[PDB]
Amino acid sequence: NLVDMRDVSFTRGNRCIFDNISLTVPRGKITAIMGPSGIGKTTLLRLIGGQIAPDHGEILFDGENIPAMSRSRLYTVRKRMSMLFQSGALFTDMNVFDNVAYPLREHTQLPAPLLHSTVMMKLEAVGLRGAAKLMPSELSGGMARRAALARAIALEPDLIMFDEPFVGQDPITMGVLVKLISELNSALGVTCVVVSHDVPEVLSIADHAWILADKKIVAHGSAQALQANPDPRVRQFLDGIADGPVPFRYPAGDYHADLLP
Amino acid sequence: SLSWMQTGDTLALSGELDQDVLLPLWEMREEAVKGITCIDLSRVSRVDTGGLALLLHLIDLAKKQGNNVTLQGVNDKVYTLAKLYNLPADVLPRH
Amino acid sequence: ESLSWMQTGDTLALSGELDQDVLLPLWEMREEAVKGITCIDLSRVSRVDTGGLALLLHLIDLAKKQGNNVTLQGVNDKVYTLAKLYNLPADVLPRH
Amino acid sequence: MLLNALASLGHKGIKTLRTFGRAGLMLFNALVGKPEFRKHAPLLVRQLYNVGVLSMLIIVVSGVFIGMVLGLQGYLVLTTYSAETSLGMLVALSLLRELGPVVAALLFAGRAGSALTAEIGLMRATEQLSSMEMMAVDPLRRVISPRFWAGVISLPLLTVIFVAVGIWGGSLVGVSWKGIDSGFFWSAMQNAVDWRMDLVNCLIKSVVFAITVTWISLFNGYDAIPTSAGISRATTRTVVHSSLAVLGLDFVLTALMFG
Amino acid sequence: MLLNALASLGHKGIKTLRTFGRAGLMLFNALVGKPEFRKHAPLLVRQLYNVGVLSMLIIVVSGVFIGMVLGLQGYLVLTTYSAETSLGMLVALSLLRELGPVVAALLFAGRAGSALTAEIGLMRATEQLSSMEMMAVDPLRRVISPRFWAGVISLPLLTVIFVAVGIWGGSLVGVSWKGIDSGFFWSAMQNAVDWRMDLVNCLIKSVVFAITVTWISLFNGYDAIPTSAGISRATTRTVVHSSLAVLGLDFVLTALMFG
Amino acid sequence: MQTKKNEIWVGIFLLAALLAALFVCLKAAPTYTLYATFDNIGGLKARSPVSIG
């Protein structure tokens, strides 16, 4: 196991997010952490990277403390994470060729003719070799998300975190991003963490599902044992039904007192 | 950690092909590239995307001398990354 | 687009079509319109919108405070279809 | 009324102390680190083009107009004492004392100060500073450290162009339109022969009004809501906070140097 | 080069006529139309709080900061002249002829003029102006027309507050430690102040400085790309355009009615 | 560390630094005092410098 979130609990000043949740992911596997909108699915990956510190709890980085090394030591662990974001996380003041080689000019010591042979072939893994001298503002929504995948494999990481991928896109580019995770899991040997909410496509590539409901952990089954779970909260996050544990209708607010008078 | 010995018409790499130990091999490759007809590597740990670009540059400079090179004893971890990056057969002769 | 309503045999017979643009002769003269009406029958209607259905709900509260009830007959298909969509409670005129 | 009226004041008293808390902590962790001179050497020329070169289309073309209205309005008011000799006296003395580092500060914060907030605030909306924080590179040294130094040394370099466009801008009404060329106009301009007055005090006010503008321009862009409305809200509040920082401190800087 | 040299300059002249041609067409449809008097009566009160009331805090606190610096610098230049009783012809005459509608218009474009452009730009990204076309109402007469009349009647009203506080601000720094009385300062101020000379002519130039500022804030808010970067680009565009429309018209309005 | 307690101690130092520097820079204006009687002073104002030579 890479990260061991035992008793982590995140609570803001107004509304709390996590209260005694538990996450477990092994190495070389794909684990999808699904959940509805409204809850802090973006802030779940921030605790692994160490950008914010939790109130009560710890993240065990395979025998190493995450929020206890904030003095010139978190940067040595952050070089092998390469967190991928939902929107375009690449810079707009340069071309897309300098975005992929951006961790290669400050961390690795590679010459200039050797850098052109290790970055141009990284774009062939995502299929963007011909689009190398193009501006990031000229790319589309699905094309700019694939440029951040070549930047994620620029330092050979061990735990890639996909913060809401292939959401709000066409099914042409949605079938591309689901295939690139399976090609980078077996041929490279990395761990992918997906926190998307799209049900009928993330279960075909993942090996562990973690459905969040009532801001707690209610499901910890696999990709095949999740559909046979007799739970009212787990099955409501499946194929579309309106009624369930959460109500789509607002409760009784004295409808007879404001309709006729 | 990277070290190599000079054998007559035989090159062997012993160590790890990381992204920081390729400094003395890149600066001392001009006077040693003309003596390769076969590549036989046995003791390797892992070949990443930074060490794979160095092996691609040792093929094109050897083809201009007049002879071609072969590749034997290649581990399965190197050939797995060749299909991921869509590498052709002329830059990496496999069997 | 005409409101040909009459009250002779204590039964308000609504004619024409109830819309959101012709409601002036029926909303202003509504206090002395219903005083002892126990049955409302309408036949010459085609479609009732949301604004036309809001006038029928206000006539029930003016009749419930008098002491007696009121029953409605001659319902169209468009009346009860929008009533199930808007989720009317049990404190108003029912589907009887 | 002793507890209900003071309940809303506690929410606006703690957050005002935390407003200046993150403003001084961001600027402190940008210069006390490791000193690199060759790494930010291409980065400083890139930020100097946006702040200092693109701001020349507002200060130069309008600095002649401020120098022109100081000659027209400064001529009819002195028709009974000195209409030609003291024409170039009130132009060169006012532009080098209070019109130099104050009037050009509103033009510097309107183009190079308001867009500096929207430049940092756009990176937090599409998560550009968070991706740079995920590497081993300091995010407070790539978008803050070369951008703060490109605004400190830019406004004294832009003030002298505003001065030279104001003195020469007042010369079109001096040597022309019923005036003398150099007999009575330029002879009354070198009355301040001392190097302390109008040269050091003009340069002192240009450095102080350059740090206080670029500090709020980099604070509202770094602390904003990551949405479409949070960037436009911090752009409006930058111009209001910078205008009170160059006018409220103008009375402070004058009371010890001109009194 | 000579044949390809006009390919970059001649194409900009076509888009310049299309830019100014759409500003006059938008203002013609927003004013000339149905006389909506009873419908636009609560709309003018709503658009007077964010333009007149919310922009009243900056001009009041800067009115005392524009007289305490002008009245203190004006005391040292009148040294060794025996003209200490003529302070009213410098702090109150320059705030009505030179200053006044010029400095307050630069603060109007930063607080009220900058927020008026970002308000329509935030509603264009959410397509709120395009939804008014589906409700069978005129979008140029409901969201643009109450915002033009609320800005043309506020800036002449905010000019008098900038003058009267700045006159009292000059009297605050006047009798503070100089030892002068309150009879000599208000004696020279009454001279050369009458009808159609300084008080009326300040109101004449103020309403011209209110149309040209609010025309740019409503045009760039209506002509913007509905994205996250198009709102911030048009927000800083109105501050540069209003700085050249106020200072650029200062040379034109000085040649007519000198004083 | 935390993110709610380490911020209130920085703002109490920067605001005190911007306030103590303002009070020391505004000195624009055991004091033994004498009294003297005149008959016609003239146009003398307050805070006028007395000089010996």
CA distance A16 to B28: 60
- Tell me which residue of E241, E50, E113 sits closest to D235, measured CA to CA: E113
Chain A touched by C57 (CB under 8 Å): yes
Distances (CA, A) of E200 to E104, E194, E207: 17, 9, 11
Report the b/e string of A179-201 with b at 16+ CB within 10 A. eebeebbebbebbbbbbbbbbeb
SS3 C77: helix
**Residues with Cβ < 8 Å from F25, sequence gap 6 or more?**
D252, D256
Amino acid occupying residue D61: V
Nearest residue on chain E to D114, alpha-carbon basis? E236
CA distance D94 to A41: 59
Residue A54 tokens read as 């939790």
Burial class (CB in 10 A: 0-12, 13-18, 19+), E196: exposed
Cβ atoms of residues D186 and D233 within 8 Å: no
Q: How far, rounded to the nearest angstrom, does the alpha carbon of residue D223 sit from its chain's CA centroid?
A: 21
Contact: D136, A91; criterion CB under 8 Å: no
Cβ atoms of residues A69 and A230 within 8 Å: no
Residue A34 tokens read as 């699904």
- Tell me which residue of E55, E103, F20 sits closest to D246, measured CA to CA: E103
Cβ atoms of residues E68 and E169 within 8 Å: yes
| Angle A40-A41-A45 from CA coordinates, rounded to 5° | 110
Cβ atoms of residues C57 and C30 within 8 Å: no
E strand residue ranges, B1-95: 3-7, 10-17, 39-40, 44-47, 71-72
Residue A142 tokens read as 């699905």
Rounded to a whole number of angstroms, the distance from the CA of A53 to the nearest CA of chain F is 7
* Chain A CB contacts of D137 below 8 Å: 106
CA distance A117 to A107: 17
CA distance A89 to A164: 13
Distances (CA, A) of E94 to D74, E91, F20, F32: 10, 6, 35, 44
SS3 D26: helix
* Torsion sign (Cα): D202, D204, D210, D213: negative
Nearest residue on chain F to E180, alpha-carbon basis? F45
Cβ atoms of residues E42 and E146 within 8 Å: no
Amino acid occupying residue A227: Q
Could you tell me whether strands A191-194 and A30-32 are parallel, antiparallel, or unpaired per DSSP bridges?
A: parallel
Return the bridge partners of B72, or none.
Answer: B40
Return the bridge partners of B14, or none.
Answer: B3
Cβ atoms of residues D233 and D224 within 8 Å: yes
* Chain D CB contacts of A159 below 8 Å: none
Neighbours of chain A (3+ CB pairs under 8 A): B, C, D, F
Cβ atoms of residues E66 and E99 within 8 Å: yes
Cβ atoms of residues D77 and E92 within 8 Å: no
Distances (CA, A) of A125 to A139, A154, A177, E170: 18, 12, 11, 72
Burial class (CB in 10 A: 0-12, 13-18, 19+), A121: buried
Q: Name the one residue in this structure whose structure tokens are 């109101």.
A: E203
CA distance D95 to D202: 9
| DSSP secondary structure letter of residue B66 | S
C-alpha neighbours within 13 Å on the C-beta side of residue B33: 20
Burial class (CB in 10 A: 0-12, 13-18, 19+), C82: middle
Return the bridge partners of A191, or none.
Answer: A159
Q: Which of A102, A137, A159, A164 to mutate to test the interface with D (most CBs of D within 10 A)?
A: A102
Return the bridge partners of B12, or none.
Answer: B5
Amino acid occupying residue A90: L
Amino acid occupying residue D76: L
C-alpha neighbours within 13 Å on the C-beta side of residue F42: 2
Contact: A86, D127; criterion CB under 8 Å: yes
Amino acid occupying residue E212: T
Residues in chain D: 259
Q: Which helix (H) or strand (E) holds D240?
A: helix D228-255
Return the bridge partners of B39, or none.
Answer: B11, B71
- Tell me which residue of C71, C45, C48 sits closest to C59, measured CA to CA: C71
Rounded to a whole number of angstroms, the distance from the CA of F43 to the nearest CA of chain E is 10
DSSP E115-143: HHHHHHHHHHHTTHHHHSGGGTS-HHHHS
Cβ atoms of residues F11 and D18 within 8 Å: yes
Q: Name the one residue in this structure whose structure tokens are 């036949």.
A: C43
**Residues with Cβ < 8 Å from D27, sequence gap 6 or more?**
D144, D148, D215, D218
Return the bridge partners of B5, or none.
Answer: B12
Q: Which of F6, F15, F23, F27 to mutate to test the interface with D (most CBs of D within 10 A)?
A: F15
Q: Name the one residue in this structure whose structure tokens are 């699915």.
A: A41
C and B: touch, per 3+ CB pairs < 8 A?
no
CA distance E60 to D96: 26
CA distance E86 to E188: 5
Contact: E179, F47; criterion CB under 8 Å: yes
- Tell me which residue of A256, A32, A252, A254 sits closest to A163, measured CA to CA: A32
| DSSP secondary structure letter of residue C37 | -
Contact: C60, A255; criterion CB under 8 Å: no
Contact: F25, D18; criterion CB under 8 Å: no
| DSSP secondary structure letter of residue C15 | B
**Distance between terminal CA atoms of chain C?**
28
Amino acid occupying residue E116: L
Chain F touched by D251 (CB under 8 Å): no
| DSSP secondary structure letter of residue A237 | G
CA distance A51 to A125: 29
Q: Which helix (H) or strand (E) holds B25?
A: helix B23-27
* Chain E CB contacts of D244 below 8 Å: 58, 61-62, 65
Residue E104 tokens read as 């307050």
Technique of determination: cryo-EM
Rounded to a whole number of angstroms, the distance from the CA of F37 to the nearest CA of chain D is 30
CA distance E106 to E166: 16
C-alpha neighbours within 13 Å on the C-beta side of residue D3: 0
CA distance E186 to E174: 11
Contact: B84, A183; criterion CB under 8 Å: yes
Cβ atoms of residues A54 and A23 within 8 Å: no
Q: Name the one residue in this structure whose structure tokens are 């027209």.
A: D72
- Provide Rg for chain B, Cα atoms: 13
H helix intervals, E78-198: 88-91, 103-125, 128-131, 139-142, 145-152, 155-174
C-alpha neighbours within 13 Å on the C-beta side of residue E186: 8
Cβ atoms of residues E82 and E29 within 8 Å: no
Domains, chain A, in order of start with CATH, read 3-260 (3.40.50.300)
Chain D touched by F7 (CB under 8 Å): yes
Contact: D136, A85; criterion CB under 8 Å: no
Contact: A256, C89; criterion CB under 8 Å: yes
Q: Which helix (H) or strand (E) holds A47?
A: helix A46-49
Chain D touched by F39 (CB under 8 Å): no
Q: Name the one residue in this structure whose structure tokens are 């019109």.
A: D99
Q: List, as own/partner pairs, every contact residues A177-185 make where C-beta atoms lie below 8 angstroms and the sequence separation is at least 24, other chains included.
A: A177/A142, A177/A145, A177/A146, A178/A202, A178/A204, A178/A205, A180/A125, A180/A126, A180/A146, A180/A149, A181/A30, A181/A205, A182/A30, A183/A125, A183/B84, A184/A125, A184/A149, A184/A153, A184/A160, A184/B84, A185/A28, A185/A29, A185/A30
Distances (CA, A) of F7 to A55, A57, B3, D29, D217: 16, 22, 52, 14, 20
Rounded to a whole number of angstroms, the distance from the CA of A116 to the nearest CA of chain B is 9
Q: List, as own/partner pairs, every contact residues F29-38 make where C-beta atoms lie below 8 angstroms and the sequence separation is at least 24, other chains included.
A: F29/E177
**Residues with Cβ < 8 Å from A212, sequence gap 6 or more?**
A21, A33, A34, A35, A36, A39, A41, A218
Could you tell me whether strands A3-8 and A59-61 are parallel, antiparallel, or unpaired per DSSP bridges?
A: antiparallel
Q: How many CB atoms lie within 10 A of CB E144?
A: 21
DSSP A55-92: SB--EEESS-BSTT-TTTTGGGTGGGT--B-SS--S-S
**Distance between terminal CA atoms of chain B?**
29
Contact: B52, A118; criterion CB under 8 Å: yes
CA distance E88 to A219: 81
Q: Which of B16, B17, B18, B19 to mutate to test the interface with A (most CBs of A within 10 A)?
A: B19
Q: Who among F8, F27, F28 is closest to D17 (CB)?
A: F8
**Considering only residues 50 to 69 of chain D, which have any Cβ-Cβ distance to chain E shorter than 8 Å?**
57-58, 61-62, 65-66, 68-69
| DSSP secondary structure letter of residue B39 | E
Nearest residue on chain D to E89, alpha-carbon basis? D77
Residue D49 tokens read as 């083009």
Q: Who among A81, A90, A106 is closest to D134 (CB)?
A: A81
Residue E122 tokens read as 């935030």
Domains, chain B, in order of start with CATH, read 2-85 (3.30.750.24)
* Chain E CB contacts of F48 below 8 Å: 179
Maximum separation of any 2 CA atoms in chain D, in Å: 73
Q: Which helix (H) or strand (E) holds B63?
A: helix B49-63
State this model's resolution in angstroms: 3.6
Residue E16 tokens read as 């310049």
C-alpha neighbours within 13 Å on the C-beta side of residue D20: 17
| DSSP secondary structure letter of residue E40 | S
Amino acid occupying residue C8: T
Cβ atoms of residues A2 and A22 within 8 Å: no
**Considering only residues 192 to 231 of chain E, which have any Cβ-Cβ distance to chain D shorter than 8 Å?**
228-229, 231
Calculated CA dihedral for residues B65, B67, B72, B75, nearest 10 degrees: 30
Residue D232 tokens read as 């436009």
CA distance E23 to E29: 10
Q: How many CB atoms lie within 10 A of CB B80?
A: 14
Distances (CA, A) of F1 to A56, A67, D20, D131: 11, 8, 20, 22
- Tell me which residue of E150, E258, E137, E170 sits closest to E211, measured CA to CA: E150
Cβ atoms of residues E218 and E148 within 8 Å: yes
